[PDB]
Design an enzyme around this catalytic site. Sequence first.
Site, PDB file in Angstrom:
ATOM      1  N   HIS A 314       0.840  -1.194   0.000  1.00  0.00           N
ATOM      2  CA  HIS A 314       0.000   0.000   0.000  1.00  0.00           C
ATOM      3  C   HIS A 314       0.878   1.248   0.000  1.00  0.00           C
ATOM      4  O   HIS A 314       1.793   1.372   0.809  1.00  0.00           O
ATOM      5  CB  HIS A 314      -0.925  -0.010   1.222  1.00  0.00           C
ATOM      6  CG  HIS A 314      -2.163   0.821   1.050  1.00  0.00           C
ATOM      7  ND1 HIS A 314      -3.275   0.375   0.363  1.00  0.00           N
ATOM      8  CD2 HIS A 314      -2.461   2.071   1.475  1.00  0.00           C
ATOM      9  CE1 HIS A 314      -4.199   1.320   0.361  1.00  0.00           C
ATOM     10  NE2 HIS A 314      -3.733   2.356   1.034  1.00  0.00           N
ATOM     11  N   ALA A 315       0.612   2.157  -0.934  1.00  0.00           N
ATOM     12  CA  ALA A 315       1.438   3.354  -1.077  1.00  0.00           C
ATOM     13  C   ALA A 315       1.412   4.199   0.193  1.00  0.00           C
ATOM     14  O   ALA A 315       0.408   4.249   0.904  1.00  0.00           O
ATOM     15  CB  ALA A 315       0.940   4.212  -2.242  1.00  0.00           C
ATOM     16  N   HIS A 344      -0.441  12.287  -5.910  1.00  0.00           N
ATOM     17  CA  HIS A 344      -1.014  12.350  -4.569  1.00  0.00           C
ATOM     18  C   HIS A 344       0.079  12.233  -3.510  1.00  0.00           C
ATOM     19  O   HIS A 344       0.181  13.075  -2.608  1.00  0.00           O
ATOM     20  CB  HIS A 344      -2.062  11.239  -4.400  1.00  0.00           C
ATOM     21  CG  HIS A 344      -2.645  11.166  -3.022  1.00  0.00           C
ATOM     22  ND1 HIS A 344      -3.849  11.746  -2.688  1.00  0.00           N
ATOM     23  CD2 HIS A 344      -2.165  10.614  -1.884  1.00  0.00           C
ATOM     24  CE1 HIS A 344      -4.092  11.542  -1.402  1.00  0.00           C
ATOM     25  NE2 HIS A 344      -3.081  10.861  -0.891  1.00  0.00           N
ATOM     26  N   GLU A 345       0.900  11.179  -3.599  1.00  0.00           N
ATOM     27  CA  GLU A 345       1.965  10.969  -2.616  1.00  0.00           C
ATOM     28  C   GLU A 345       2.972  12.110  -2.628  1.00  0.00           C
ATOM     29  O   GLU A 345       3.460  12.534  -1.570  1.00  0.00           O
ATOM     30  CB  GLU A 345       2.681   9.647  -2.873  1.00  0.00           C
ATOM     31  CG  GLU A 345       1.786   8.442  -2.741  1.00  0.00           C
ATOM     32  CD  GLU A 345       1.198   8.334  -1.353  1.00  0.00           C
ATOM     33  OE1 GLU A 345       1.813   8.844  -0.383  1.00  0.00           O
ATOM     34  OE2 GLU A 345       0.105   7.773  -1.244  1.00  0.00           O
ATOM     35  N   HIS A 348       1.910  14.867  -0.411  1.00  0.00           N
ATOM     36  CA  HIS A 348       2.285  14.734   0.997  1.00  0.00           C
ATOM     37  C   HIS A 348       3.730  15.171   1.222  1.00  0.00           C
ATOM     38  O   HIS A 348       4.028  15.862   2.201  1.00  0.00           O
ATOM     39  CB  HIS A 348       2.112  13.295   1.475  1.00  0.00           C
ATOM     40  CG  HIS A 348       0.689  12.850   1.619  1.00  0.00           C
ATOM     41  ND1 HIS A 348      -0.237  13.527   2.384  1.00  0.00           N
ATOM     42  CD2 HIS A 348       0.055  11.755   1.144  1.00  0.00           C
ATOM     43  CE1 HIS A 348      -1.390  12.882   2.352  1.00  0.00           C
ATOM     44  NE2 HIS A 348      -1.240  11.803   1.604  1.00  0.00           N
ATOM     45  N   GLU A 372      -4.432  15.631   2.403  1.00  0.00           N
ATOM     46  CA  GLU A 372      -4.796  14.729   1.321  1.00  0.00           C
ATOM     47  C   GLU A 372      -5.094  15.466   0.025  1.00  0.00           C
ATOM     48  O   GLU A 372      -5.058  14.850  -1.048  1.00  0.00           O
ATOM     49  CB  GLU A 372      -6.017  13.910   1.718  1.00  0.00           C
ATOM     50  CG  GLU A 372      -5.819  13.062   2.939  1.00  0.00           C
ATOM     51  CD  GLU A 372      -4.680  12.073   2.753  1.00  0.00           C
ATOM     52  OE1 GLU A 372      -4.403  11.699   1.591  1.00  0.00           O
ATOM     53  OE2 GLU A 372      -4.053  11.684   3.763  1.00  0.00           O
TER      54      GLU A 372
HETATM   55  C1  LIG Z   1       0.955   9.942   7.860  1.00  0.00           C
HETATM   56  C2  LIG Z   1       2.035   9.649   6.814  1.00  0.00           C
HETATM   57  O1  LIG Z   1       3.168   9.723   7.155  1.00  0.00           O
HETATM   58  N1  LIG Z   1       1.733   9.261   5.435  1.00  0.00           N
HETATM   59  C3  LIG Z   1       0.371   9.165   4.937  1.00  0.00           C
HETATM   60  C4  LIG Z   1       0.081  10.536   4.330  1.00  0.00           C
HETATM   61  C5  LIG Z   1      -0.240  11.587   5.390  1.00  0.00           C
HETATM   62  O2  LIG Z   1      -1.392  11.624   5.903  1.00  0.00           O
HETATM   63  O3  LIG Z   1       0.655  12.398   5.763  1.00  0.00           O
HETATM   64  C6  LIG Z   1       0.185   8.114   3.830  1.00  0.00           C
HETATM   65  O4  LIG Z   1       1.014   8.048   2.992  1.00  0.00           O
HETATM   66  N2  LIG Z   1      -1.004   7.247   3.753  1.00  0.00           N
HETATM   67  C7  LIG Z   1      -1.154   6.269   2.662  1.00  0.00           C
HETATM   68  C8  LIG Z   1      -2.339   6.593   1.751  1.00  0.00           C
HETATM   69  C9  LIG Z   1      -2.238   5.809   0.428  1.00  0.00           C
HETATM   70  C10 LIG Z   1      -3.395   6.022  -0.559  1.00  0.00           C
HETATM   71  C11 LIG Z   1      -4.772   5.672   0.061  1.00  0.00           C
HETATM   72  O5  LIG Z   1      -4.907   4.848   0.925  1.00  0.00           O
HETATM   73  N3  LIG Z   1      -5.930   6.341  -0.478  1.00  0.00           N
HETATM   74  C12 LIG Z   1      -7.257   6.021   0.007  1.00  0.00           C
HETATM   75  C13 LIG Z   1      -8.285   7.040  -0.472  1.00  0.00           C
HETATM   76  C14 LIG Z   1      -8.007   7.609  -1.862  1.00  0.00           C
HETATM   77  C15 LIG Z   1      -8.399   6.924  -2.999  1.00  0.00           C
HETATM   78  C16 LIG Z   1      -8.146   7.460  -4.251  1.00  0.00           C
HETATM   79  C17 LIG Z   1      -7.500   8.687  -4.360  1.00  0.00           C
HETATM   80  O6  LIG Z   1      -7.235   9.247  -5.619  1.00  0.00           O
HETATM   81  C18 LIG Z   1      -7.112   9.371  -3.219  1.00  0.00           C
HETATM   82  C19 LIG Z   1      -7.368   8.835  -1.965  1.00  0.00           C
HETATM   83  C20 LIG Z   1      -7.633   4.645  -0.587  1.00  0.00           C
HETATM   84  O7  LIG Z   1      -6.975   4.205  -1.567  1.00  0.00           O
HETATM   85  O8  LIG Z   1      -8.569   3.924  -0.123  1.00  0.00           O
HETATM   86  C21 LIG Z   1      -3.201   4.965  -1.770  1.00  0.00           C
HETATM   87  C22 LIG Z   1      -3.651   5.699  -3.105  1.00  0.00           C
HETATM   88  C23 LIG Z   1      -3.900   7.029  -2.780  1.00  0.00           C
HETATM   89  C24 LIG Z   1      -3.365   7.257  -1.200  1.00  0.00           C
HETATM   90  C25 LIG Z   1      -2.315   8.086   1.465  1.00  0.00           C
HETATM   91  O9  LIG Z   1      -1.306   8.589   0.891  1.00  0.00           O
HETATM   92  O10 LIG Z   1      -3.312   8.787   1.808  1.00  0.00           O
HETATM   93 ZN   LIG Z   2      -2.788  10.665   1.122  1.00  0.00          ZN
END
Ligand SMILES: CC(=O)N[C@@H](CC(=O)O)C(=O)NC[C@H](CC1(C(=O)N[C@@H](Cc2ccc(O)cc2)C(=O)O)CCCC1)C(=O)O
Ligand SMILES: [Zn+2]
Length: 586
Positions: A314-315, A344-345, A348, A372
Site C-alpha cells: 500500500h502506497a 497524490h503521494e 504529501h 490529502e
Molecule cells: C501519515 C504519513 O506519514 N503518510 C500518509 C500521508 C499523510 O497523511 O501524511 C500516507 O502516505 N497514507 C497512505 C495513503 C495511500 C493512498 C490511500 O490509501 N488512499 C485512500 C483514499 C483515496 C483513494 C483514491 C485517491 O485518488 C485518493 C485517496 C484509498 O486508496 O482507499 C493509496 C492511493 C492514494 C493514497 C495516502 O497517501 O493517503
Molecule cells: Zn494521502
Amino acid sequence: DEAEASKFVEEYDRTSQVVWNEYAGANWNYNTNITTETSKILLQKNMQIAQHTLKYGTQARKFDVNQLQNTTIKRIIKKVQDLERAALPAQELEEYNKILLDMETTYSVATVCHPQGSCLQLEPDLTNVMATSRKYEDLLWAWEGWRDKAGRAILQFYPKYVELINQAARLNGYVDAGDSWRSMYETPSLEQDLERLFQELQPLYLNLHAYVRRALHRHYGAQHINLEGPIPAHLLGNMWAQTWSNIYDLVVPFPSAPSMDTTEAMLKQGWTPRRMFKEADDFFTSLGLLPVPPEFWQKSMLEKPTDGREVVCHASAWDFYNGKDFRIKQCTTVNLEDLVVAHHEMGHIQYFMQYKDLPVALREGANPGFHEAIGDVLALSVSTPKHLHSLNLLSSEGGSDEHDINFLMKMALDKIAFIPFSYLVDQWRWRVFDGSITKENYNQEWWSLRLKYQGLCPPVPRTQGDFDPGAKFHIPSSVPYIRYFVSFIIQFQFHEALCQAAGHTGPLHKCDIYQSKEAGQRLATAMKLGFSRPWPEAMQLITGQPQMSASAMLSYFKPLLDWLRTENELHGEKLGWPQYNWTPNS
Ligand SMILES: CC(=O)N[C@@H](CC(=O)O)C(=O)NC[C@H](CC1(C(=O)N[C@@H](Cc2ccc(O)cc2)C(=O)O)CCCC1)C(=O)O
Ligand SMILES: [Zn+2]
Ligand SMILES: *[C@@H]1O[C@H](CO[C@@H]2O[C@@H](C)[C@@H](O)[C@@H](O)[C@@H]2O)[C@@H](O[C@@H]2O[C@H](CO)[C@@H](O[C@@H]3O[C@H](CO[C@H]4O[C@H](CO)[C@@H](O)[C@H](O)[C@@H]4O)[C@@H](O)[C@H](O)[C@@H]3O)[C@H](O)[C@H]2NC(C)=O)[C@H](O)[C@H]1NC(C)=O
Ligand SMILES: *[C@@H]1O[C@H](CO)[C@@H](O)[C@H](O)[C@H]1NC(C)=O
Ligand SMILES: [Cl-]
Ligand SMILES: [Cl-]
C-alpha cells in the site's frame, strides 16, 4: 508561568525530533522488509516513543493552559497533553501494539489461491483482475476470495482493538476513539457540515449510479442487474467499488470518440515508476514549489522489490522529522491510475517540506483533509486531455463535445463515485467506536451503509464470520478515512481558486494550472502554516473564503450533470434504489 511553558515547548521539540526520527526508521524497515526481526525492533521502538510521550505528556498536563497568554504555545501544550496510546497501562499498551501489528501483517500478506494452482496477492494480481476482467464469475472469485482470506482473518482482532483504542481515548479526555478522531478538525459542527456536503452531491451521484447501472445491465445481462435496485459490488472495476473508472470501457458516453490506451502508451514509450515520480516533481516545481531532495531518490522504494522481501505494498509517504529525509513507498504499476497516485503521494512530500521549519507538534496539515488534497489538486490538472496529450498518452481530443463528455465521465467515475464510499467508512467506524454497532452486527451494519449511501449490494450473501471491513486497508491499519471525503470536496475548491488566480476562463474542467506561479504561491503560504492555526485560515489563504463548500465540485461537473439528467430521463431510469431489498438471485 509563561516562561516555563515556552521553555517546555522548546524541550519537547528538541527531544521529539530525535525520538520520532528513530521510530520512523524502524517503522520503515518493517514496512519495506516484513520479518520477525524488524517486527520485534518496531515493537521495541514503540515502547521507547511511548516513554517519551508519557514523560512529556505528564509534564504538559501540569500547565493550566487557561493561564497562558501566547496562543501558539497554548496550542502546542494542549496537543502534548494527549498521550494517545501511551496513556494505556504498560500491559494493555503492549497488547494494543501487538494487535495493530498483527492486523497490518495479516492484511499485507493475505493471498487468494486456486486449488492446485497459483496464489494471488492483492497488489497487483487481484487489483488487475477487478480492473480488467469482464466475466461475472471471475470477478466474483476475486471479490469473495479476498474477503474470505483477508476480512475473515481480521475479525479475531477487531473487538479487542476497539476496546483498547477507546480506552486510550477516554484516558485522554474523549468519550471514545471516534470523538478523538473527529477532534482533529477542531470543528464542533463537523458531522452536520459533512452531512450537508454529502446531500449537495446526491443528485450527481444518483444520476451517475443510474447511468452506470444501465450500462452494466447491457453487458452483464438483465438476469443479473436490477434496473431499480442496488448494483452488485464486484462489477465496478475496483476491489471496494470505491472508484469506478476502470469500467470506463463499458460506460463510455460516446464510443465513436475513442481514447488512446493509456497503459499501452506508457509501456510502449518506456515509462517507469521513476519517470512517474519525476513528472510529479516537475509539476510541483513548475508552480514555484519545492523539489524533493536528492536523498528522496536514493531511499524511496518506488516499486515492488524482487529479492523475496515481503513488503507492505500500500502506497505511503514518509516524514522522518529531521527536515531533510522524505520518502515514498509504493509498489508502483506503470499505468495512469498509479501516475495519479504518484502525484497524490508527492503532495504529501510537498507539505512535509513546506512546514519543516515549524515545531514538530505543528507539523501536520491544517486539517487531515488538507494534507490529502494538495497532490490531488495538481493531479486534476495533470488529468486533463490536453495535459495527457502533452505527455503523449492521449491523442488530440480538443474541439469535440463528445470527447469532453467522455472526459467528464472518466473523472466522475473516480471523483463522484468515491464521495459516498469515503463518507460511509467512518460513519461505520464512528458507530463502532461509540458502541452503536457491536461485533454481533459489524458486517450487517456495513452492508446497510453500503446500500444506504452507495446503493451497492453484495454479490454473494454474507454469512456469520464475515468481516468485510477488514478487507479494506485502513480498517486493520487504523487510519481514519473522513480525511478523504473532505479532500475530495475541497480539492475542487482549491482547483477553482487556483485556476481563477492563474487567469483561466471558461469551464473549470478545462483548466490546467501547470507552471502558474500565482497558483503555487497560494498553496505554499497555506501549507507553511502547518497546524499552527485553525484550518479556516488556510482555507481563506487559498480560496478567499473560510468554508468547505460543494459548489466548486458541482460547477466542475455541471455539464455532465446536465447530460446525465437528459440521458437518464430519455431511458426512463428510476433514480436511487427504491427496491433496496434486491440482491442477486444467482
Ligand atoms: C501519515 C504519513 O506519514 N503518510 C500518509 C500521508 C499523510 O497523511 O501524511 C500516507 O502516505 N497514507 C497512505 C495513503 C495511500 C493512498 C490511500 O490509501 N488512499 C485512500 C483514499 C483515496 C483513494 C483514491 C485517491 O485518488 C485518493 C485517496 C484509498 O486508496 O482507499 C493509496 C492511493 C492514494 C493514497 C495516502 O497517501 O493517503
Ligand atoms: Zn494521502
Ligand atoms: C507566541 O510564540 C510564538 C512562538 O515563539 C517561538 O517559539 C517559542 C517556543 C520560543 O522559543 C520563542 O522564543 C520563539 O520565537 C511566536 O511565533 C514566532 O514569532 C516570531 C516573530 O516574533 C517568528 O519569527 C520569524 O521566523 C522566521 C523564520 O523562522 C523559522 O525558520 C528558522 C530557520 O529556517 C527555524 O530554524 C526556526 O525554528 C523558525 O521556525 C523569520 O524569517 C522571520 O523574519 C521571523 O523572525 C517565528 O517564526 C514564530 N514561530 C512560530 C512557531 O510561529 C509568536 O510571535 C508569539 N506571539 C506573541 C503574541 O508574542
Ligand atoms: C531484512 O531484514 C533482515 C532482518 O529481519 C535484515 O537482516 C536484512 O538486511 C533486511 N534486508 C533489507 C534489504 O533491508
Ligand atoms: Cl465490502
Ligand atoms: Cl481524518
